A paper describes a structure:
The release of inorganic phosphate (Pi) from actin filaments constitutes a key step in their regulated turnover, which is fundamental to many cellular functions. Here, using human and bovine actin isoforms, we combine cryo-EM with molecular-dynamics simulations and in vitro reconstitution to demonstrate how actin releases Pi through a ‘molecular backdoor’. While constantly open at the barbed end, the backdoor is predominantly closed in filament-core subunits and opens only transiently through concerted amino acid rearrangements. By combining cryo-EM with in vitro reconstitution and MD simulations, we have elucidated how Pi is released from F-actin and that the hydrogen bonding network between the Pro-rich loop, sensor loop, and R177 strand forms the predominant backdoor.
Through this approach, we reproducibly formed short (~50–150 nm length) filaments and finally obtained a cryo-EM structure of the barbed end at 3.6-Å resolution. Importantly, we did not find any evidence of an ABP that remained bound to the barbed end, indicating that our structure was the undecorated barbed end of F-actin. All actin subunits in our reconstruction adopt the aged ADP-nucleotide state, indicating that we captured the barbed-end structure in a state that resembles a depolymerizing filament. Although the overall arrangement of the ultimate (A0) subunit is also similar (Cα r.m.s.d. of 0.9 Å between subunits A0 and A2) and remains flattened, we observed several differences when we compared it with the internal subunit A2, including small rearrangements in the W-loop (residues 165–172) and in the hydrophobic plug region (residues 264–273), as well as a disordered F-actin carboxy terminus (residues 363–375). However, the most striking rearrangement is the downward displacement of the Pro-rich loop (residues 107–112) by ~3 Å, which—unlike in internal actin subunits—is not stabilized by subdomain 4 (SD4) of an adjacent subunit. Hence, N111 loses its hydrogen bonds with G74 in the sensor loop (residues 70–77) and SD3-residue R177 and instead interacts with E107, within its own local loop. As a result, R177 can no longer interact with the sensor loop. In conclusion, the hydrogen bonding network formed by R177, N111, H73, and G74 is fully abolished, which opens a hole of ~5 Å in diameter in the structure that connects the internal nucleotide-binding site to the filament exterior. Thus, our structure provides evidence that, under depolymerization conditions, Pi can dissociate from the nucleotide-binding site at the barbed end without large protein rearrangements, thereby revealing the structural basis for why the ultimate barbed end subunit of actin releases Pi at rates that are orders-of-magnitude faster than those from subunits within the filament core.
Numbering used by the authors:
A (entry chain A), C (entry chain C), D (entry chain B): 6 to 45, 49 to 372
B (entry chain H), F (entry chain I), G (entry chain J): 1 to 7
E (entry chain D): 6 to 45, 49 to 362
């Protein structure tokens, strides 16, 4: 069974081919203490171990905007995800990888070198995250708006042939929302600043905030009563109440001007991807929109997207937003299907092919 | 990144 | 039973000579994908299969102006006609084909070689398209004004057997009208450039274009009101309204100077063709003018043809424009009758005579 | 003294009749602030002023693909051109305008309205850009290929008598190359996404990009050494190096398949335009090819155009590419000659002629 | 001296009397632009000027086949002949005009008033083209095979006077062959249809076409061996090859059944014309057969005419096909001799008689 | 544009 | 075609 490891900006999912769910999922963070140990452990903690003791460690995300910014920490995560999470030697099973589109060539080139040299995997393949997500849905035509923690990309696919000229990539994802949420949380007096305290903010994001159907009326509604106000309990026991910030932090996805970014919203970006496609294939792309990634798990994001695309799209068009409940692990599930597909069993990159040519073999 | 952005 | 395969510039028709309607009618186009396949499809699509998936294909017409420009491509359509549409082995039944008049000798010669070598048909025959049209109308003396996508030929026929010295061929037909339509469709701001977008224009031409009785008064009528504007819905869903362009495109048939061609219009070409015949015969040909081909399906073209020919022809004698309702498949229907006619059965070019002479025997 | 203002997709050139160079050249952009103001200037910045403060504004091009997509912004540029750059009153001198061929009928129709009610110009003429380019060279015969910022077109002219049916227009120009350059620049790790950063890419294109004579040979050369790598300095002091992208971005002109466009290359488009012309005038067109526009200033494009056409064109024919060093302002320089022509004073659209009839007089 | 202006169908020849060759030989085409002009215009181009810019012109011949279509276009060419090509004014000197054999006087009467009123020539003389062909050949008796670009005339003149009853007209000329050439040129895949491409076909006909002595024998040679194939270069640089079209277009003259005409060939028409005259002069006509016109320049036509007529004519008669190399300009050359005569002053149609 | 392209 | 037109 070929290993399917999907390294994400915020969380990485690793498992086995043919299974329906990832075997081990842990946050993609490597942390080291910022103090000295007077008492009589380890230099660096990686994975869920770092989260448990995060009050001392300095959490660093090795992946930023889908680009490996620190190859030292990448070697730690992969070494930990094989020998401590999956408990399988990588010298016998081929490993499948997922990478965001429009990434630097060096990013996937050094990914090739590490496993061929350090882990000595028999073979490995790198696939687009959006392409794999369509496999999980069981479909063959649609625009995969894959919004993650570091990257947000929409890759239109029609009857197998994917259009590379219509692929749009945005640096607007969950981590930007988390930074924005802690910025607006200061208006109520809460001052989560430290990188260890950032994970607390993310927990607030994963439980309370939601996407409003319309922004204008909800601002008046939240400022005229206290129905929308919700209470959250900090790990130390302190209780905080957040009101209109629930529908403001996820609102940055559709109005990126809040963060100072000039890029269009996720509703405009996924609509712009359709227009770059040909006129004939636009009909089958409007009704087959597929969402994926942890960013698209907000309550009501599907309804908001349907309303926003309808205004941009022609009135006669029928817009359908497909939001499977398992879309958090949609990329990995599609990757598990690929590694079991018979035709794909010959598309891998053998060790012999790497030796004769070099790292450049991966780009094809 | 190298030029533009941080990564 | 004998197959009657009437390969056309835009659309090819295949039947069984025992029916009044072709069994399989599909566009004569072969499309190939212009993007790579990341969804791990066939190399090329032929016919109506390519039309449905025309968004991701570069449609190429193997026939241009009644001349097979891509013999490798045409060897596929016939393979698709016999084995996929009609689902009958050519090795058991004879095959009838139609070729436009005044065609290069190498065009028909290579047709004979392919069928007697690649498909090994027991017998073959190439018949003039116009002669078959007359037999469909139950007439033996009339000038057939056939117009398709590449060939607009007027072949006068007198007691059958046609008159070779009076055959006029004009290279202005439906495909030119399609190309002219998109050139003038940019007037209102609609840009159709790609091959896939061309087929959309062809649907617009087939459903909204009509021949004006008087071009001058229709230009003024359309420029003073909006009763002539009609709305068509694109596959994407955008609504486009075309006004004077409804009758400007079909007017290129009668005024080829719009396309910058020195050739006379189809109304004058028919008049010129009759003048090349004998004086006594000109009485019969004028009263038995028979239209054919899909190009002559515009609403009111027959009435306009009568008015134009009457002015050129002497006033002492009458003009009768015959417009059968089935003239789109007139060429094939005559082939169906001819193949079922007892006389033609002695005109089958058998395989044994082919080997003793070669492909040059078809010219007769 | 007739004013000759040539509005382009990227830059608009304004000056005076009888001169040899444009008086004022500035980018055709209207930008407005996005970040909220704090210290107590203007609502919108137009021209080179937007270039200086491009780090804060959102730069928008009022002209895209030769079609004015925003008439509000377009009026500002003309107002800024007359009253800030030329510093002249339009009420006393005529204005000569240029438009791309095969443009929407309502495009220049609004152009006549603006100069006749907002500026009250005494007269105004609209001429095709390709026609004016032949004026500057002093020639009377040749196929003018005008590859501008938004529209690339080839308009053959023989002894003054143009051939509208041989005019081919391509929606592939410098702006598309700029968008393609930043798409491939992400391969090395440089990410330019804001419209302000687009100007940085455009500056890179105008300095380091060039057209390779043999694309296949050059690609192997760039991957086997480091001779082609060149260093460019960003405005913030960062130094970046680009390798094979120097000849890859301009290569899209000859192979539009890189952009995903089905249209033919600039070499094929020029050859296809000549083929539409008659046989007798083909001889005088092969030896008189004229290039114009900023896009055609790549070092080595003239040599590449000579080689590509030579393979397509008959070997007997002698092809001579004319590449004047001042081809950037060939449209304006030819326009200046037209305004100073004595015979041209009778073709000015007078104010009396416009108001009595309406905008219908233009498009003649 | 006098102007020998030959307003022949197609090629028109002009010159001065007493000269050996025409000074100006330019096509009789009045071309007009079809594509609009965006930049600069000579609304009509006439003659050699139109041929140079023939790509963007609609070349219309003012003379169809002897029947002048536009009498306004004819004045344009005559205006071009005097003022442009010859740069002379017919006011000082008379003009000489050539006439196609057996034409209605309606054609002549309109010709008379144009020279006398539009141009005010002091004198003018209309002469039969066929008669002048024998004059340039040095013999006043015989039969003239007048075969031009429009209409073929078989005029067996006697003592310098044409026989009205013996004139036979065959509508088989160079223009009809030119149309037939491109009709059969489409067999090999070459399609010339517009008026501009018609001139290209004519140059091919004048340079590559030849008459085969034996039609059936050459067919076997043409099919078996491609030695008869020859290459021609188009103005655009393309190269084309013709294998049997070289001798299949000129063969239409002898076998009009190729083009659907029930009439007989020039060889049979020549034989028919001789019998219409009296028997006593028939032997004289058989010996003196002078070909004329540009149509009869296909190499080997004299041998083919010699062979075809000999079989048709009785064995007792002797056949001598006189084929001067200058047969194209014989109509003009003969006119120069006639005008140079000192006795030509008597039958001048002066201004007084108009 | 209106139909096709963007402009 | 070969000479004339495209086909
Ligand atoms: N239910 C949820 N509500 C809000 N945010 C979520 C939810 N689930 C995941 N996220 C956010 O989405 C981000 C992306 O996580 P995920 O898509 O699982 O992996 P990847 O890092 O590969 O995108 C996470 O950083 C997380 O903060
Ligand atoms: N009802 C119609 N109205 C207008 N145009 C039509 C109509 N039907 C067919 N056409 C056009 O006429 C052309 C002729 O096609 P057809 O006669 O069916 O076969 P062929 O290719 O042999 O001519 C078609 O390409 C089509 O574009
Ligand atoms: N030297 C150069 N090298 C590369 N590209 C250039 C150069 N000069 C101009 N360009 C590009 O050509 C485009 C066309 O500009 P120009 O032809 O001057 O005006 P217009 O906007 O009318 O086309 C510009 O957008 C510019 O980016
Ligand atoms: N050497 C030649 N070979 C074949 N054809 C020729 C030759 N010279 C002229 N012709 C053709 O013969 C035709 C007759 O021309 P000409 O005799 O000069 O004028 P006209 O027809 O008025 O007598 C012309 O149209 C020309 O194309
Ligand atoms: Mg992910
Ligand atoms: Mg047909
Ligand atoms: Mg320009
Ligand atoms: Mg003559």
């Amino acid at each position: 069974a070929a290993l399917v490891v999907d390294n994400g900006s915020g969380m990485c999912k690793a498992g086995f081919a043919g299974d329906d769910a990832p075997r081990a999922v842990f946050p993609s963070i490597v942390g080291r203490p910022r103090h000295q140990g007077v008492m009589v452990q380890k230099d660096s903690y990686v994975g869920d171990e770092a989260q448990s003791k995060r009050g001392i460690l300095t959490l660093k995300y090795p992946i930023e905007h889908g680009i490996v910014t620190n190859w030292d920490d990448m070697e730690k995560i992969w070494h930990h995800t094989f020998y401590n999470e999956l408990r399988v030697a990588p010298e016998e099973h081929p490993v499948l990888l997922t990478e965001a589109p429009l990434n630097p060539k060096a990013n996937r080139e050094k990914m090739t070198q590490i496993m061929f040299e350090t882990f000595n995997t028999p073979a490995m393949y790198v696939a687009i995250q959006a392409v794999l997500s369509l496999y999980a849905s069981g479909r063959t035509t649609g625009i995969v708006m894959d919004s993650g923690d570091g990257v947000t990309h929409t890759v239109p696919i029609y009857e197998g042939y994917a259009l590379p000229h219509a692929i749009l990539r945005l640096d607007l994802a969950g981590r930007d929302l988390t930074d924005y949420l802690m910025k607006i949380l200061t208006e109520r007096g809460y001052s989560f600043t430290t990188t260890a305290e950032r994970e607390i903010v993310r927990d607030i994001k994963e439980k309370l905030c939601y996407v409003a159907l319309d922004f204008e009326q909800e601002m008046a509604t939240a400022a005229s009563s206290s129905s929308l106000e919700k209470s959250y309990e900090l790990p130390d026991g302190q209780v905080i109440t957040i009101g209109n910030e629930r529908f403001r932090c996820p609102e940055a996805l559709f109005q990126p001007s809040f963060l100072g970014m000039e890029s269009c919203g996720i509703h405009e970006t996924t609509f712009n991807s359709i227009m770059k496609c040909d006129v004939d294939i636009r009909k089958d792309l409007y009704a087959n929109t597929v969402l994926s990634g942890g960013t698209t798990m907000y309550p009501g994001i599907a309804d908001r997207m349907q309303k926003e695309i309808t205004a941009l799209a022609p009135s006669t068009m029928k817009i359908k937003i497909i939001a499977p409940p398992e879309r958090k692990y949609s990329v990995w599930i599609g990757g598990s299907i690929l590694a079991s597909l018979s035709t794909f069993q010959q598309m891998w990159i053998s060790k012999q092919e790497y030796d004769e040519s070099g790292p450049s073999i991966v780009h094809r | 990144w190298x030029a533009x952005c941080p990564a």
